[PDB]
Coordinates of C-alpha atoms and ligand atoms in Angstrom, one line a residue:
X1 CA -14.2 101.1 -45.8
X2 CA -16.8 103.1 -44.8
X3 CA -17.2 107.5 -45.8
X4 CA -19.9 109.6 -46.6
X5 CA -19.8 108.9 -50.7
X6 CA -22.4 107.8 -52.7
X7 CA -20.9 104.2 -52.6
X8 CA -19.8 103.6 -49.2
X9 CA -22.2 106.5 -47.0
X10 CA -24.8 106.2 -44.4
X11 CA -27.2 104.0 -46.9
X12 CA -24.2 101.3 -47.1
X13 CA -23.1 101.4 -43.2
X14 CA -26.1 98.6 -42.3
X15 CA -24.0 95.7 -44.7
X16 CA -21.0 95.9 -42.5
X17 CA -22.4 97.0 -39.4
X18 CA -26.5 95.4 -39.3
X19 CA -26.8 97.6 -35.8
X20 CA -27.2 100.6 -38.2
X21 CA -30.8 99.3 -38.1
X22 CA -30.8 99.0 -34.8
X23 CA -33.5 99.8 -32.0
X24 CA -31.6 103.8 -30.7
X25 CA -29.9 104.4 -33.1
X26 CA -28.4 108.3 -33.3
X27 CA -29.1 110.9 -35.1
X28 CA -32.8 111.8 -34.9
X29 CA -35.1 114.6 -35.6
X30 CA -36.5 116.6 -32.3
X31 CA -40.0 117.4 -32.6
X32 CA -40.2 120.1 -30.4
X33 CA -43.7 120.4 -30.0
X34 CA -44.3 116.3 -28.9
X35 CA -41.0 116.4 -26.9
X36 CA -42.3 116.2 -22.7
X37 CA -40.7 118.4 -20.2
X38 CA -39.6 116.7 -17.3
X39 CA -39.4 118.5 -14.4
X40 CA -37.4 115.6 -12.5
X41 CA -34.3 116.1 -14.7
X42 CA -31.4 117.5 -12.3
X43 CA -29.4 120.3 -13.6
X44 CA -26.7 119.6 -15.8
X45 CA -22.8 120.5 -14.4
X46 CA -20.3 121.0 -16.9
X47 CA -16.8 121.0 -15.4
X48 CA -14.3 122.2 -18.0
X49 CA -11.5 124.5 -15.3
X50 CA -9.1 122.0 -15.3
X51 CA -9.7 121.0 -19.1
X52 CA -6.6 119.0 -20.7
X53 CA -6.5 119.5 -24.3
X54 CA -3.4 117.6 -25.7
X55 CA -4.0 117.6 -29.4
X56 CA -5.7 117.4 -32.8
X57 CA -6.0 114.7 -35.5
X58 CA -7.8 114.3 -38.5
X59 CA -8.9 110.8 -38.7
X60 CA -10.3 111.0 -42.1
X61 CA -14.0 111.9 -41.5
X62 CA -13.7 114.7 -39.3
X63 CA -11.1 116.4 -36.9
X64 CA -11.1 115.3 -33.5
X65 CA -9.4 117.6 -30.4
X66 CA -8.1 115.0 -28.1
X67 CA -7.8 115.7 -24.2
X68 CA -6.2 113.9 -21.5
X69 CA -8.9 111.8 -19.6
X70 CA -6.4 109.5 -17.4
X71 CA -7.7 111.7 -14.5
X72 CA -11.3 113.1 -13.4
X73 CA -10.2 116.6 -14.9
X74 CA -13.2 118.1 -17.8
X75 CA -16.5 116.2 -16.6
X76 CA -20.2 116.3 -17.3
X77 CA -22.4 115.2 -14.8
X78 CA -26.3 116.0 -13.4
X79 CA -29.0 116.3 -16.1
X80 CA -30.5 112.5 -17.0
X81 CA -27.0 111.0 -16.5
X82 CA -26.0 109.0 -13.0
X83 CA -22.5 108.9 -12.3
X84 CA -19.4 111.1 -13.6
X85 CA -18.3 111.1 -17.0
X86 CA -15.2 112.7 -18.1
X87 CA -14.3 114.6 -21.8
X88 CA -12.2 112.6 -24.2
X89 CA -12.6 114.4 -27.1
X90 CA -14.6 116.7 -29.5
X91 CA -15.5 117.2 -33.1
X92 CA -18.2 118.5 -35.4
X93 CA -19.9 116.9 -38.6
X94 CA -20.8 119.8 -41.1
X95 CA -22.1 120.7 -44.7
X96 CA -21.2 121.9 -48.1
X97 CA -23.4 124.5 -47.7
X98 CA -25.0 126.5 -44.6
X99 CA -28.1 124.7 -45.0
X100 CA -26.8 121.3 -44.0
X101 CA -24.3 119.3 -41.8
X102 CA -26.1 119.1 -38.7
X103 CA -26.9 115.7 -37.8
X104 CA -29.5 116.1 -35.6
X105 CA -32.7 118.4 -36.8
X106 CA -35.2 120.6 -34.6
X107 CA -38.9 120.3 -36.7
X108 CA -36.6 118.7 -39.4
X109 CA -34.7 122.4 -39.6
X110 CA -31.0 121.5 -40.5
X111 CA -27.9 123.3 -39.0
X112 CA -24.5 124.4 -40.5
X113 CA -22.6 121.7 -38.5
X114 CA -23.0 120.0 -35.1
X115 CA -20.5 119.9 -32.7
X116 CA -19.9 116.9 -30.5
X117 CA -18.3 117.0 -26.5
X118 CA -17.7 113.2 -25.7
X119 CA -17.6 111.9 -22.3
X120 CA -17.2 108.3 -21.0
X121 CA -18.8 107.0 -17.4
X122 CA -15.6 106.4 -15.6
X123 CA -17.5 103.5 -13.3
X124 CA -16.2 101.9 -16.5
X125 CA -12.4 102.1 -16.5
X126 CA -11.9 103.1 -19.9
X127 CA -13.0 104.4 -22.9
X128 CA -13.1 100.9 -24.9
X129 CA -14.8 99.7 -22.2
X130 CA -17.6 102.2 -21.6
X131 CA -18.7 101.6 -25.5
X132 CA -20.0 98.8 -24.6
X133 CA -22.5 99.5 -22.2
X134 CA -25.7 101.3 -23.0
X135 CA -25.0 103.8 -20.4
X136 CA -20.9 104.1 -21.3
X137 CA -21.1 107.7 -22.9
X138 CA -22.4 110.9 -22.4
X139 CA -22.7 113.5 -25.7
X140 CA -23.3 117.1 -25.6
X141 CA -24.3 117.8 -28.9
X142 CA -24.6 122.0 -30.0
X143 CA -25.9 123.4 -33.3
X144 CA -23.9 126.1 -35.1
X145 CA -25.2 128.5 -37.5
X146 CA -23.6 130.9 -39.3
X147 CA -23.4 134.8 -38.5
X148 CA -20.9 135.7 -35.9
X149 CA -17.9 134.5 -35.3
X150 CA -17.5 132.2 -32.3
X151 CA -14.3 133.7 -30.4
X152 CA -13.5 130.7 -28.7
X153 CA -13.4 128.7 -32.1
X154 CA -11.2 130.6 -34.0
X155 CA -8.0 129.0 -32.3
X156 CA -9.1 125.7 -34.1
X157 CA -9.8 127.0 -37.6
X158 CA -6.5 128.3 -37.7
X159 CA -4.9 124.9 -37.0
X160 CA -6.7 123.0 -39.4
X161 CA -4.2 124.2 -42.4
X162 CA -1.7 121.7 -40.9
X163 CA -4.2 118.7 -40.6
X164 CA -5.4 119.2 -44.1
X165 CA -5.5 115.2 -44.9
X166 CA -6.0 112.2 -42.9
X167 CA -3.8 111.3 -40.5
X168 CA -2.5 114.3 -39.6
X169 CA -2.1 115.8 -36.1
X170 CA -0.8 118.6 -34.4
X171 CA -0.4 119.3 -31.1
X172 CA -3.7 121.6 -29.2
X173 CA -2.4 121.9 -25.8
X174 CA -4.0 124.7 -23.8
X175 CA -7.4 125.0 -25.4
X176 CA -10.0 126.1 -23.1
X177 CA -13.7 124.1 -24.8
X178 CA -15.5 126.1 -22.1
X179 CA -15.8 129.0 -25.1
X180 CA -17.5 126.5 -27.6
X181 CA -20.5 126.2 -25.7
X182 CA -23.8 128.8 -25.5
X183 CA -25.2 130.5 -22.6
X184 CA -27.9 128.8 -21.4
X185 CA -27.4 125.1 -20.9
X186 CA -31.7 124.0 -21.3
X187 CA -31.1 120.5 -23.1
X188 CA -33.1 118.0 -24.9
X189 CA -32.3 113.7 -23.9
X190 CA -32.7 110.9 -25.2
X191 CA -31.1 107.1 -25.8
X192 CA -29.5 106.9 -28.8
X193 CA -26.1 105.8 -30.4
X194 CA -22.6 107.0 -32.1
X195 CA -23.2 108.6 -35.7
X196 CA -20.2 106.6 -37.2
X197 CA -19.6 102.9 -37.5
X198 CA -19.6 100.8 -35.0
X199 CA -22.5 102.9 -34.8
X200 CA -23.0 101.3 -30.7
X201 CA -25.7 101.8 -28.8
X202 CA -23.7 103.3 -25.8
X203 CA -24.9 107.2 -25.7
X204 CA -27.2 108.9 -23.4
X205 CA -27.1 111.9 -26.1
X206 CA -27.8 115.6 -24.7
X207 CA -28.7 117.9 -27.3
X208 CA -28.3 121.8 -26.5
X209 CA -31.5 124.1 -27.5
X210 CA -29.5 127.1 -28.0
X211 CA -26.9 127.2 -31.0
X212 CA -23.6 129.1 -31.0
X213 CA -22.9 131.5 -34.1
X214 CA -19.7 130.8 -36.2
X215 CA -18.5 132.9 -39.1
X216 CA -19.0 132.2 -42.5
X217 CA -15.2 132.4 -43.0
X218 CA -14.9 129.7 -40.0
X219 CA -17.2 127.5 -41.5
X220 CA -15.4 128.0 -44.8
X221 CA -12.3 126.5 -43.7
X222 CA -13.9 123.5 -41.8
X223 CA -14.8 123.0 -46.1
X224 CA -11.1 123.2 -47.0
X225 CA -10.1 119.9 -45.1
X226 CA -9.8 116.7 -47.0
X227 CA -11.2 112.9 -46.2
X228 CA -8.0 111.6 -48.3
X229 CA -5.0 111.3 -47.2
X230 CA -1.8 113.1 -48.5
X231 CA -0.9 112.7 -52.0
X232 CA -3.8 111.1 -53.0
X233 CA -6.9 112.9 -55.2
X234 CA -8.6 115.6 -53.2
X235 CA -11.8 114.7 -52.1
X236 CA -13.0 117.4 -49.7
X237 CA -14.2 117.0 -46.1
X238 CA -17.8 118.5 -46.1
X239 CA -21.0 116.6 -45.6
X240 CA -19.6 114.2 -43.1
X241 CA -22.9 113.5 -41.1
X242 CA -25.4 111.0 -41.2
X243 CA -29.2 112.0 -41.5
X244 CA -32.0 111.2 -39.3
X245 CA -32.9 107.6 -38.1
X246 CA -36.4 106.3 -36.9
X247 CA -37.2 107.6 -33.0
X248 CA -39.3 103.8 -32.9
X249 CA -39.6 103.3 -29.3
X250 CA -37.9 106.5 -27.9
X251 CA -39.1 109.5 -26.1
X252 CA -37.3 112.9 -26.5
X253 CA -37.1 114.7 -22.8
X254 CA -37.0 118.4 -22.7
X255 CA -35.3 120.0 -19.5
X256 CA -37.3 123.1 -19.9
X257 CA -41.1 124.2 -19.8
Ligands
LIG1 C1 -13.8 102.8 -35.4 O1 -14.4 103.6 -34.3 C2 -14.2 103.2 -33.1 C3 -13.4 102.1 -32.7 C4 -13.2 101.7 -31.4 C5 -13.8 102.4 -30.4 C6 -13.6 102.0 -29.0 C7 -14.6 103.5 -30.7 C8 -14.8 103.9 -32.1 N1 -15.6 105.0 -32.4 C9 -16.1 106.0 -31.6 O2 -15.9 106.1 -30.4 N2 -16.8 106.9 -32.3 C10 -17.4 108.1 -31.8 C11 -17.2 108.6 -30.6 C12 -18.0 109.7 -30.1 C13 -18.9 110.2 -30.9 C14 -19.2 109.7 -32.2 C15 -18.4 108.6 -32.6 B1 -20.4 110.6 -32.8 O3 -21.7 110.0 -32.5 O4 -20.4 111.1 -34.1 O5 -20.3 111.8 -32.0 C16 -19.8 111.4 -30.7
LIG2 ZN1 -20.1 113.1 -33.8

């Protein structure tokens, strides 16, 4: 099956799944200086109050924090997207080293990690459904980088000791995602796809400009977690994101001047 080795990483995903050379597919570099402000963007609404988180899982290429979405409670809404869509899940891809894990890249800089807030367009009924349409999901992607320590992230780091392999959970009720994200909301959009196989062409993807600052000891024990499961050789979870793929015929949308 597919990982992030040398044998069965990103350069492999295409034999299995050919849409990995696809026409939007996800990540991609932002060239900030050729990416167009549009001024007809709306503003973007994220509604996290009544948040759901339920629990966490390590699904053996990164850890995801599950909410409930069988009810319009977190949703993101406004910006380039039409409709409601409402937060499933979240998770980040990150490095072996500070100077990597982020998939996307601003002027081909790379970030510490990347975190991920998914949301499905509930005009589709359901998650499995809403994959399938180009339109189906809505990411807010946010760039970490390491200095401070992010408050509202410390509350996962210190779970992640009992989700050390793959398939392990633990239950995250309560967790509020409205302190994982920056002050200002200005955004970059465009097309694009999920980062892991089945690598669909379903996202409208929503990149924050502004990173959030983790600690060095936070990002430390994202490093500790392991892609294997228990009782099998320790193979640790870090550089579990895919590089940039070709813009082709894409244009990048800024939301700010
Ligand atoms: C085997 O995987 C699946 C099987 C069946 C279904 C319906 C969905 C998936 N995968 C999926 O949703 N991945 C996925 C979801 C959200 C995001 C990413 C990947 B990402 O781009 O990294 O960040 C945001
Ligand atoms: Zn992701």
């Amino acid at each position: 099956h597919w990982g992030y080795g040398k044998h069965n990483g990103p350069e492999h995903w295409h034999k299995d799944f050919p849409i990995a050379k696809g026409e939007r597919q996800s990540p991609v570099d932002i060239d900030t200086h050729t990416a167009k402000y549009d001024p007809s963007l709306k503003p973007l609404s994220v509604s996290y109050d009544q948040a759901t988180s339920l629990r966490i899982l390590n699904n053996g290429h990164a850890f995801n924090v599950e909410f409930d979405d069988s009810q319009d409670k977190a949703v993101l809404k406004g910006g380039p997207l039409d409709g409601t869509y409402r937060l499933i899940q979240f998770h980040f891809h990150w490095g072996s080293l500070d100077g990597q894990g982020s998939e996307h890249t601003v002027d081909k800089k790379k970030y510490a990690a990347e975190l991920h807030l998914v949301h499905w367009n509930t005009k589709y009924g359901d998650f499995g459904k809403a994959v399938q349409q180009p339109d189906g999901l809505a990411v807010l992607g946010i760039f970490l980088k390491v200095g401070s320590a992010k408050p509202g992230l410390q509350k996962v780091v210190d779970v992640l000791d009992s989700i050390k392999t793959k398939g392990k959970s633990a239950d995250f009720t309560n967790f509020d995602p409205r302190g994982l994200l920056p002050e200002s909301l200005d955004y970059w959009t465009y097309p694009g796809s999920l980062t892991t196989p089945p690598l669909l062409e379903c996202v409208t993807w929503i990149v924050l400009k502004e990173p959030i600052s983790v600690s060095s000891e936070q990002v430390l024990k994202f490093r500790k977690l392991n892609f294997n499961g228990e009782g099998e050789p320790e193979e640790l979870m870090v550089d579990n994101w895919r590089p940039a793929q070709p813009l082709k015929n894409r244009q990048i949308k800024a939301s700010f001047k």
